[PDB]
Amino acid sequence: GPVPFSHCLPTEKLQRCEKIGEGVFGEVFQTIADHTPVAIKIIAIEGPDLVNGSHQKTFEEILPEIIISKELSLLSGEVCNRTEGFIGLNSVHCVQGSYPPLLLKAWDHYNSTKGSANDRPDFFKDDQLFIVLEFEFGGIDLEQMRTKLSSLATAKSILHQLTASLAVAEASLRFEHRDLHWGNVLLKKTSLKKLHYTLNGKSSTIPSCGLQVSIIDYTLSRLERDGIVVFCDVSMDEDLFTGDGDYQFDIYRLMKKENNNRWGEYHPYSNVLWLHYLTDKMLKQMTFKTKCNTPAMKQIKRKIQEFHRTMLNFSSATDLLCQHSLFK
Numbered sequence: 112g113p114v115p116f117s118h119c120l121p122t123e124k125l126q127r128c129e130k131i132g133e134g135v136f137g138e139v140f141q142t143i144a145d146h147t148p149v150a151i152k153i154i155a156i157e158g159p160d161l162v163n164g165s166h167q168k169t170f171e172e173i174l175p176e177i178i179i180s181k182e183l184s185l186l187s188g189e190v191c192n193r194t195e196g197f198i199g200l201n202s203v204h205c206v207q208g209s210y211p212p213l214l215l216k217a218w219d220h221y222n223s224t225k226g227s228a229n230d231r232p233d234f235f236k237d238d239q240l241f242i243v244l245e246f247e248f249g250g251i252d253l254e255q256m257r258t259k260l261s262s263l264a265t266a267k268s269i270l271h272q273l274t275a276s277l278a279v280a281e282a283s284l285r286f287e288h289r290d291l292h293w294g295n296v297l298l299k300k301t302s303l304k305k306l307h308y309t310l311n312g313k314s315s316t317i318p319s320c321g322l323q324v325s326i327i328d329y330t331l332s333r334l335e336r337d338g339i340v341v342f343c344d345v346s347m348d349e350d351l352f353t354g355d356g357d358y359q360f361d362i363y364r365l366m367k368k369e370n371n372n373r374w375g376e377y378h379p380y381s382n383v384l385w386l387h388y389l390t391d392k393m394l395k396q397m398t399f400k401t402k403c404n405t406p407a408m409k410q411i412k413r414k415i416q417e418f419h420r421t422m423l424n425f426s427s428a429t430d431l432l433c434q435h436s437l438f439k
């Protein structure tokens with residue numbers, strides 16, 4: 112049965128919570144336990160109130176995100192298909208209660224400093240259910256790092272990391288992320304010079320440029336195990352396909368074209384579409400501290416441009432990783 116908030120967030124952990132993000136789904140907090148940061152994603156479920164203007168998910172509707180989070184986290188410990196490029200999942204709980212006053216304090220601080228589009232979550236009763244997902248702390252998103260990266264060599268590493276992670280997940284799980292906008296790519300410092308992955312039993316390395324990438328947010332994702340498909344059926348969603356003002360919103364439409372509006376099917380070309388959108392961001396909206404001036408750096412820039420103009424002719428992240436000249 113459900114547990115109280117105090118089970119996930121004992122007093123000291125709760126006192127250290129700071130809000131780091133939000134969406135219509137709910138709230139994301141950072142806190143510390145055993146000297147280590149973690150991220151806490153809190154989603155109201157099963158109740159009748161609108162939350163942030165939308166109906167709460169049922170438990171049936173939130174299960175896919177839970178399952179996919181666990182499966183992708185487990186890839187860090189596998190053998191034939193291994194990657195650390197998805198965020199680690201520490202724990203998942205179903206909590207019952209009103210929102211903790213200490214989290215409301217954190218919510219208010221964020222509203223005062225950054226501004227919130229959400230409702231202050233102070234209207235929940237003591238029978239309210241929530242899902243609390245505790246993740247590894249993955250760093251800062253690519254959008255927030257728009258003006259923060261060193262050079263296009265860093266952009267190459269990031270694209271390589273993303274492509275390898277998606278490929279491993281394709282091979283293991285027939286995985287499609289389906290919403291890999293630049294808010295869902297996290298970056299954190301690593302002292303490792305090379306990062307390791309294994310794809311269908313073959314191990315390789317990627318130079319890190321001092322950053323480790325984590326892919327997050329599996330709310331629209333799809334995968335399967337033993338022919339049981341887990342996904343989000345958006346075939347009757349209207350709004351998802353009528354965005355404008357960013358290539359992001361074209362990707363939703365291009366996915367629907369690729370899959371004939373049948374979201375249970377496996378179309379790993381959607382991973383290619385998202386990688387193309389991310390490459391487009393690298394070349395058009397990211398701005399680097401050091402521009403390409405040396406021959407070796409000039410070569411890197413031309414290669415990323417070449418990737419941009421060719422990658423749409425590959426069938427999956429796996430095809431890209433294994434056959435594209437960018438990764439040789």
Ligand SMILES: O=C1NCCN(C2CC2)/C=C/N(CCO)c2ccn3ncc(c3n2)-c2cccc1c2
Pocket residue numbers: 131132133134139150152198246247248249250251252255294297327328329
């Ligand atoms: O689905 C998830 N969240 C989406 C919401 N998102 C909120 C909308 C901004 C990310 C918020 N931010 C701010 C980025 O700069 C972090 C920062 C560090 N970390 N470390 C792990 C997560 C996370 N989110 C995480 C893990 C799994 C799922 C989610 C988040």
Ligand code: NA
Pocket residue numbers: 118204
């Ligand atoms: Na527990």
Ligand code: NA
Pocket residue numbers: 397398399
């Ligand atoms: Na620039």
